[PDB]
Write a protein that binds this DNA or RNA. Structure first.
Length: 184
RNA sequence: GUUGUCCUCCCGGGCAUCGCCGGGCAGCUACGCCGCAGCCGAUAAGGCCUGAAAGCAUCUAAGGCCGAAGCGGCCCCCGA
């Protein structure tokens, strides 16, 4: 099990992303927008030491080392968030009634969900943009977290739990996440 | 309207503890009429995102998104 005792990690940043700290809060600014996050752990200093952002605490514990690596991964997703967007594709597939998925406002509305005269809805955050092209639907946007939430909110609304789950199966599902979610 | 009886008595009255019966206004009542929301925020159970401990995976270990007739505002009653 991990041989740390400093504990100190180092996070590699290019010259194409600059990062500036002011307290225990990290802001990452690159070509395409910027994104700020708050990393909230107590007793840990996050600071920029030259070209590298370093996350450290003097007293190592098993719990602190997990938190340090999670924060380090968050900066990396932010880095590849501020260079280029993340794309998840979802497909709408249906059991009987053609099903019309359009974005009206800052919510996606789905109508003709099993012949329904009522909406199913899922929230679409401003950092994420949702475009519908036929019955492929693409959730796209700056940050991996924003993109992950927006896409998943769409699947859960349409989610079948009200009847049989092997025979009633109409709804829009996560065809791409970055593999094929999710099985046992 | 009407029985008995009293006033001589038509008229007009007493009493039988409203004499009894018939109608019914005001007023009071139902066996009458009229009125008595939504939404939101924060949460449960739950569904999940990112994501480690365990380079992967994972709804949780931190961060984050929703979500109860229940909880508050909203609402009704009292209140120098």
């Amino acid at each position: 099990m991990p041989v740390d005792a400093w504990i100190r990690e180092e996070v590699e940043i290019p010259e194409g992303v600059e990062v500036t700290v002011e307290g225990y809060k990290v802001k990452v600014k690159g070509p395409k927008g910027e994104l700020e996050r708050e990393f909230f752990w107590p007793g840990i200093q996050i600071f920029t030491e030259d070209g590298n952002v370093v996350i450290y605490k003097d007293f190592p514990r098993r719990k602190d080392v997990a938190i340090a690596r999670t924060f380090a991964a968050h900066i990396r997703n932010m880095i590849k968030g501020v260079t280029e967007g993340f794309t998840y594709k979802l497909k709408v597939v249906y059991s009987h009634f053609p099903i019309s998925v359009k974005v009206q406002g800052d919510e996606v509305i789905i109508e003709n969900f099993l012949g329904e005269k009522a909406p199913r809805k899922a929230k679409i955050l401003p950092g994420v943009t949702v475009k519908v092209r036929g019955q492929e639907i693409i959730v796209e946007g700056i940050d991996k977290e924003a993109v992950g939430q927006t896409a998943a909110n769409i699947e859960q609304a349409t989610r079948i739990t009200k009847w049989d789950r092997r025979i009633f199966q109409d709804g829009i599902y996560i065809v791409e996440k970055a593999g094929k979610p999710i099985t046992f």
